[PDB]
Design a binder for this molecule. Structure first.
Ligand SMILES: Nc1ncnc2c1ncn2[C@@H]1O[C@H](CO)[C@@H](O)[C@H]1O
Ligand SMILES: Nc1ncnc2c1ncn2[C@@H]1O[C@H](CO)[C@@H](O)[C@H]1O
Ligand SMILES: Nc1ncnc2c1ncn2[C@@H]1O[C@H](CO)[C@@H](O)[C@H]1O
Ligand SMILES: Nc1ncnc2c1ncn2[C@@H]1O[C@H](CO)[C@@H](O)[C@H]1O
Lengths: 241, 238, 241, 238
């Protein structure tokens, strides 16, 4: 009946959301730099490129009216402000902002424009856009300045976006994951991965991709969740190290 | 295996919706409220601020099955300015709101947690889940809502230290902060508030609060957090 | 020219604020359970008792128009939700709420009512009420449920109070101290005191009472600071333990 | 001993006020802005997004005395809806706001911090203090302020991880989030915003922002925090 667009759907959180949406009955289109082998429609592209996002949005609309949009594409970075040879590189900082923040904004503006004339459902909804930030937007650790800044931008985008899109019947919600198998964790060594996981109160483990997917699906089913950032982190509050 | 649930404030509004949803989910539900009602639920009449009443309700739940879900939805409201026409905001009215909304929630949390501390962990390592109810007033209190806001801000702040400690026992603590809902709780003010909700542009339905509560119970990763359920509302001064 | 009322002025933060205000030229009245030997006016009483607060407010007004009110009276508690014999006591929880939250509200409502007819200054201000919360209102540690709850109430009171009192030209601001020599620290053993202090990024030490006083005086001198909670914590974010 | 200061955006508004206040405080002040001005300050014309320009300004400051205070007040605004009449919010306009407000602030922070990393600590153990400027829009962005809000939210989030790392070098990082100020930056919208400020019921004066910046510099305990300077304003959707 409806289509969904999931960026970053080739793996991790995006993959879980895409599979859950497919099982729920959505005609799912994945936008990712890579393609995989699940029973999903894969559009290979970059969220920072408007042409690629536009192609993915149109592909979804060809399947059915676009209702659910999940931005889960992102990159991580572990780099200190003061390095051993000099200060944090400017290009690495720019890249993280480009993918995590600009990419999310790019998907939001393009999907929203394309969904603006959707016939509303019984709740008056034309669609729902779910973005993915990180707890790093709130308790960034040493070495996470770029990542934290990019995610803080996503967090701040939530309200002004929801406020405007409310007139069009489009909700905007942000999920802020704690420690899961994502680029954040992937860019760290074992020693670091262990100590970080040890900081999570309960469940005392890495989050399961399916748990992120479950929250995303609940957001889609609950009209009252809007303009909010939901922490999915097992009560984690990251220490400096 | 069947488990029991305790819902305070279950005679009406949000608590009632949560209790009914949990019952439909298969829980053996016990309601603690100043009054009983006529739904197919087990009712214990009492006060959340009274140790004796909460213990009675907890025991009644365990009588059915091991206690797992606890939802604190009992509360009172108050609209009173700090500076009135004849004098300052009364001290007793402030104390009462704090007692019911904050101390009552803590009373239920401490007694329920103690009762579940020895439950055999479920497949997710959980011995139980406690869901408290704050309000967006804890973040954007309007003129005249100082007492209510303060009580709910206390509930918000309690979430993390409680979750941090109870984590060792496999007991989660999460808080839902509702916006404007259609609950039994001046037309002029209600209209001004309603007009401030971006989307959906209406009062929230108790069932939507219940839906969020049930998902918290089913999602192990939601813990030590406050979830705003408000249609993007940010209350202005008036 | 103006009087000031500082609760908890017998020691620590309140004492520093009282001394700083006196040096600034204010006719300072201290409300505290104890009296001391500084060149201040001491009114012995309990912030939870309206008669005592009313006596202190009137004493200040007898000296000069009451402009600055600083609520720094408070108590601490280290008690787990699940103890060795049973759950956290209800009375200990109630006591912390009574002193830290109700006491602060009591001072605010009584001082504000008494200052409501004050001739406004050049900025239109009749007075400024500064409350004291704690970072525990945001990152409460294990054993700090009661304390955190009481301080969270103070934090939440700030905005609705400032919004209403704005019409009367009275500002309401809250300072949220990190680790200082206060009841919070005083109720802990050496081992604990050391590990807590070690969590503070910079300055890597306990805050100095004079640093809290300096912020309070700046708040009094800056009309634009209102309805906000200012963290004074050396970038501390308390871990579970 | 005399120290130098670097203030970006010092040709006007908030930055100008901070620069003038620091000069009066005894600092050897260098301003980095797209244009120079006529105050008794040292001006370096450049772009905060350009490594070469920031390095030139930092070097110019060190020429006067060891760099201690850095204030990032350079920025641009934008009012643009996500959904316009002919199409969606432009991508380049969004990128530009992010580049100047967020990347520019980071560029200044990383280069200034590197330059101060070997300064002999002062009596408080400080090698320097970096004060960034966000906006309350980072918390309550209005309709049409998505780009601006996002850029400022990034500045807010940068504060803690930067302060945490730089703590080891004795360099503090604090952020000021101004509300509505009388800066060179539609009458209909400005009026609606002004009417939302509780107290003082007026536009903030640049000098009040400067006063807060100077107190941050003088108070060692203010670190890794965002201080709202907004007269209790909480921006509504419109
Ligand atoms: N620029 C990008 N465009 C689309 N997908 C991306 C981009 N950067 C990372 N991803 C994807 O994000 C998912 C991780 O969030 C990965 O599957 C990865 O391939
Ligand atoms: N002190 C209290 N103890 C138990 N239930 C209460 C209390 N105060 C209010 N309630 C209930 O809260 C529900 C509203 O939250 C109402 O059904 C009401 O009867
Ligand atoms: N109930 C109370 N009333 C007045 N001052 C108090 C109270 N409880 C603690 N204090 C004071 O608070 C200061 C510490 O905040 C101490 O000087 C102490 O004596
Ligand atoms: N990219 C930039 N680099 C330096 N100064 C800038 C930049 N963009 C805006 N400004 C300045 O910011 C001040 C406003 O914050 C203005 O004086 C303006 O000239």
């Amino acid at each position: 009946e409806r289509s969904a667009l999931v960026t970053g759907g080739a793996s991790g959180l995006g993959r879980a959301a895409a599979l859950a949406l497919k099982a729920r009955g959505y005609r799912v289109v994945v936008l990712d730099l890579r393609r995989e082998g699940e029973d999903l429609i894969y559009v290979e592209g970059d969220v920072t490129r408007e042409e690629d996002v536009r192609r993915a949005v149109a592909r979804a609309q060809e399947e059915a009216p676009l209702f659910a949009v999940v931005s889960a594409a992102g990159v991580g970075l572990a780099e200190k402000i003061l390095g051993k040879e000099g200060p944090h590189g400017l290009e690495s900082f720019r890249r993280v902002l480009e993918v995590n923040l600009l990419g999310t904004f790019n998907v939001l503006r393009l999907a929203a424009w394309a969904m603006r004339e959707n016939p509303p459902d019984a709740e008056g909804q034309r669609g729902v856009i779910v973005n993915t930030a990180s707890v790093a937007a709130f308790e960034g650790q040493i070495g996470q300045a770029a990542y934290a800044a990019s995610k803080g931008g996503v967090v701040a985008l939530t309200l002004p976006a929801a406020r405007e899109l409310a007139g069009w019947g489009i909700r905007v919600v942000t999920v802020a994951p704690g420690l899961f198998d994502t680029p954040l964790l992937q860019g760290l060594p074992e020693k670091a991965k262990a100590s970080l996981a040890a900081q999570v109160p309960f469940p005392p483990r890495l989050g399961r991709p399916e748990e992120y997917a479950a929250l995303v699906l609940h957001i889609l089913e609950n009209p009252m969740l809007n303009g909010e950032v939901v922490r999915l982190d097992g009560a984690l509050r990251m220490a400096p190290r």
